[PDB]
């Protein structure tokens, strides 16, 4: 049994990704029995868009040789691994945006032989930061474990031997203004506090939490990934060093009967759509709708602007009637405000139809309606042109 | 609950289409309660192949410049929007099929520079005619609403700015010999006539009909699209101006519980196969079988001759035993006659096997039989090479 639809309550800033960053959502919610006492309390939680992973911007330097001959004419191109200092200088000159950097790269003019050395920097790339060990993770780094970049070496290795990575900032500096304060009620069984109800009105289970510390304030990393600052049992252990890695969760799967029909099946249908996306290297609005979370827990929304895959963090709320999401023609309420549309494209595959009317793939299907606009498929370019071959 | 198989009773002339003209069939039949009185009567209905949409043949003119240089050698090609009179003359000369038209186009011979102006006409293209407003609809026309072509401008715009469209006839002339007469029984509840039984023996519901007029004879456009000439209530309104547009039906969906298991599910499975076709731009005999109507109502059959997608109008009848459709080896009865096979290819994915035996994908599957011939996939070329990019 699942709700008919879910809609994000708050949307974080959009960020670009490729098909390989997609992941099937988690449809499990933990319920506890015996917590019958509620008492108002105040708590602190991370703002939207920072809960998943703090991201550090960067850039990659890949050098290539632009030699040629000179009446003869023939071009020659070979790659090399550059030095961090020249890489940083190149980045500064590209940040200036001066034409001098553009020419120093675009036109070789190697005119007996003549050669012109060149250093090419790729569009900014982002890498997740791990708070516990101050390590940067990303697909570009070989093995997905780059450690102590700030502590020891300003540059990190890349899969391409002639490519290196550089953070935009000289040092890994992270702003600590990532906390918001909300009200809630505390659910207590006996004396222990089994769970708390949040501002959105959704019950959060405190079972299976671990102690973490961000920005010097101690907190708990919940089962779903949300972090809240509250009192913690001394018995509770510290979070395992490994973070941001392939799913390695244990208790929930064994303790909660993963209902075959309710969870395993939905997971298989989602995996079918995800596999089709990877094989065909293209997406459609209908297929994007299959990656939506079916429960109120925190998740990730997807959309496509300028033929680029986009994603953001969000909190999902259940919907009982299609009237609430679409009160009148041309409005999709989000947080009580008509959400704006970029080129008539909403999140999670919702689009504006040719008749100037909001179309929801799971709403139209329930009415036996069909439209060719949703089916149309469009290819998505890979995020890493050079680093990953 | 659905019948095991359905077979067309009468097949109209075949016409060529592409993958984008496909649409999932309608599996809903309307049943009325209380009509217990039957009385023989005579009625008039449209012939097969005209029920869906009267089609007007046409052609598109796209001009290109064949300039070059002249010992130097270099070719130059740029497009332009031509004039209707030269377009018509070009069409007449191409209709003549004389070699003079072929050379005037195929060989530029632009031999200091030299140029040769050329006007290219595309293979005939067809456009649906709307009887109510005498307007021509087609994907080639921008926005899908070309109006008053005969009334005001002989040529209509196309998505490509250098392309225009021309009907084959100088004026939109439509033959009115599209009517056939059949017997039937009239189902009456109280005094009002709720429905009528047709010649094929299938009950037709008169609920939700609208008054239309074709060829000057007043009639009713039924829910399923069939038009019959009979007595109409004055209370019944005229059909809404909009026709041949994205599904905008309302009463049937709300009034008839679209059984989740019976209709919504089948619709989802059909949409999955249709989406796969659009993404891969290729079809297979097994996948074509998923677009067949599961009920006796009027529909459209599909097949592939000379690697070209084909379609036609048909009336479907239910089948109780596989013996009736295939009485002996090598015969598929249609209308009481063994249907002929073009290159061993029948309609709706039915093919002639290597053993000289008729194979039905939904019959072989029910016997756990499997064959590689049905799975094989073949690409289909897009219908509009220039108009649509």
């Amino acid at each position, epitope marked *: *049994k*699942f*709700p*008919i639809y879910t809609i994000p309550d708050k949307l974080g800033p959009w960020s670009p990704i490729d098909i390989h960053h997609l992941s099937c959502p988690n449809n499990l*919610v933990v*319920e506890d029995e015996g917590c*019958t006492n509620l008492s108002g309390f105040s708590y602190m939680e991370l703002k939207v868009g920072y809960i998943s992973a703090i991201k550090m911007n960067g850039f990659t330097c890949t050098g290539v040789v632009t030699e040629a001959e000179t009446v003869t004419t023939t071009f020659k191109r070979k790659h090399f691994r550059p030095t961090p200092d020249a890489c940083r200088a190149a980045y500064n000159w590209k940040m200036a945006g001066d034409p001098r950097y553009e020419e120093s790269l675009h036109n070789p003019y190697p005119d007996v032989k003549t050669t012109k050395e060149s250093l090419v920097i790729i569009s900014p790339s982002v890498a997740d930061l791990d708070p516990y060990d101050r390590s940067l993770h990303s697909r570009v780094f070989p093995g997905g474990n780059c450690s102590g970049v700030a502590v020891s070496s300003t540059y990190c290795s890349t899969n391409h031997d002639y490519t290196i990575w550089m953070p935009e900032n000289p040092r890994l500096g992270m702003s600590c203004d990532i906390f918001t304060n909300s009200r809630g009620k505390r*659910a207590s069984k006996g004396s222990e506090t089994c769970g708390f*109800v949040d501002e*959105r*009105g*959704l*019950y959060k289970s405190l079972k299976g939490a671990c102690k973490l510390k961000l920005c010097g304030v101690l907190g708990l990393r919940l089962m779903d990934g949300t972090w809240v600052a509250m009192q913690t049992s001394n018995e509770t252990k510290w979070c395992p060093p490994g973070q941001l890695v392939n799913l390695h969760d244990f208790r929930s799967d064994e303790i909660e009967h993963l209902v075959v029909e309710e969870l395993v099946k939905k997971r298989e249908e989602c995996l079918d759509a995800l596999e089709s996306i990877m094989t065909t290297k293209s997406v459609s609005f209908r297929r994007l709708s299959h990656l939506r979370k079916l*429960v*109120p827990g925190f998740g990730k929304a997807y959309t496509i602007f300028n033929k680029t895959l986009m994603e953001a963090d969000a909190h999902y*709320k*259940s919907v*009982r*009637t299609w*009237n*609430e999401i679409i*009160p009148s023609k041309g409005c999709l309420r989000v947080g*009580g405000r008509c959400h704006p549309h970029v080129n008539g494209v909403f999140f999670n595959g919702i689009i504006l139809g040719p008749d100037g009317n909001v179309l929801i793939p799971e709403m139209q299907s329930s009415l036996l309606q069909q439209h060719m606009e949703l089916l149309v498929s469009s290819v998505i370019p890979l995020m890493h042109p050079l680093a990953d071959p | 609950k659905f019948p095991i198989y359905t077979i067309p009773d009468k097949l109209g002339p075949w016409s060529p289409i592409d993958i984008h003209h496909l649409s999932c069939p309608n599996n809903l039949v309307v049943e009325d309660e209380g009509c217990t009185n039957l009385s023989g009567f005579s009625y008039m209905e449209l012939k097969v192949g005209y029920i869906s949409a009267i089609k007007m043949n046409g052609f598109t003119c796209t001009g290109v410049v064949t300039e070059a240089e002249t010992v130097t050698t270099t070719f130059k090609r740029k497009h332009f929007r031509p004039t209707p009179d030269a377009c018509r003359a070009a069409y007449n000369w191409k209709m003549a099929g004389d070699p003079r038209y072929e050379e005037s186009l195929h060989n530029p011979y632009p031999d200091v520079k030299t140029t040769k102006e050329s006007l290219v006409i595309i293979s005939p293209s067809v456009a649906d005619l709307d009887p109510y407003d005498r307007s021509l609809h087609s994907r080639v026309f921008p926005g899908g609403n070309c109006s008053g072509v005969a009334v005001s401008s002989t040529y209509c715009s196309t998505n490509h700015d250098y392309t225009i469209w021309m009907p084959e006839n100088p004026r939109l002339g439509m033959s009115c010999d599209i009517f056939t007469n059949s017997r039937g029984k009239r189902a009456s509840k109280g005094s009002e006539t709720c429905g009528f039984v047709d010649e094929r023996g299938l009950y037709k519901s008169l609920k939700g009909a609208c008054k239309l007029k074709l060829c000057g004879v007043l009639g009713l456009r039924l829910m399923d699209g069939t038009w019959v000439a009979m007595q109409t209530s004055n209370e019944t309104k005229w059909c809404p101006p909009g026709q041949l547009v994205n599904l905008h039906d309302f009463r049937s969906d709300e009034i008839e*519980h679209l*059984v*989740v*298991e019976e209709l919504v599910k089948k619709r989802e499975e059909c949409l999955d196969a249709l989406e796969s076709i659009m993404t891969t731009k290729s079809v297979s005999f097994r996948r074509l079988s998923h677009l067949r109507k599961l009920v006796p109502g009027f529909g459209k059959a599909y097949t592939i001759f000379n690697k070209t997608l084909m379609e036609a109008d048909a009336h479907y009848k239910s089948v109780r035993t596989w013996n009736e459709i295939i009485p002996s080896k090598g015969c598929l009865r249609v209308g009481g006659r063994c249907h002929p096979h073009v290159n061993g290819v029948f309609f709706n994915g039915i093919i002639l096997g290597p053993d000289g035996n008729v194979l039905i994908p939904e019959m072989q599957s029910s016997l756990l039989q499997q064959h590689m011939e049905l799975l094989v996939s073949s690409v289909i070329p897009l219908m509009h090479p220039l108009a649509d990019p």
Partner: antibody
Amino acid sequence: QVHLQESGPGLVKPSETLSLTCTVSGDSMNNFYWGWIRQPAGKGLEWIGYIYYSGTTNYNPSLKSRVTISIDTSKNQFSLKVNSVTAADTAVYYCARDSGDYVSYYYYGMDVWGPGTTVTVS
Amino acid sequence: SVLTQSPSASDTPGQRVTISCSGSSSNIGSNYVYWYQQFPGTAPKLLIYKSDKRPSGVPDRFSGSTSGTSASLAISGLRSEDEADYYCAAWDNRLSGWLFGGGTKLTVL
């Protein structure tokens, strides 16, 4: 802890309107649906409809034309008005907090019901 | 779509009684079922807060089970205080409204 009390007219002449209103005490009105249930004397229960703290409304199709529901969060009170009163209208009306099945996992179903108030038609 | 329930039930003391509600796919096959208990002249109260779960303060002899399209509420032990009218409620996706079945009146014998 939270409890509701119904208030309003007991008898009403035909062709008039009903002004029944109930108050909420001990808890906030946010994140909950609020609806009205009526029961003819000796027969089964019927669902008039509900309203959300946001203000979206929903009504029983059989009474969609005659009933309107209004809410005022500033004073923790929601009311129900019926446009036309007939002899059929006489029934016992109940106020109830509607906790949707999937809205909050902590609360399921119509938790709290106020004391039934009778309405008669002369 | 509607919910169908027995008009009345009767049984000797100390005997298991079963009350059954039958619904369509969109009523029981898609949403949870809640059973209410109403004494005469009093507002109804929620006997079970989920198809199987019991709210606090309910005697353990009450237990409900849900089939794919039907529900059932069985009382293992019959007591003089169990005589009440029982009404089953469920949500309907297509209707978009709550549906109440015909209440069954249980009388001890």
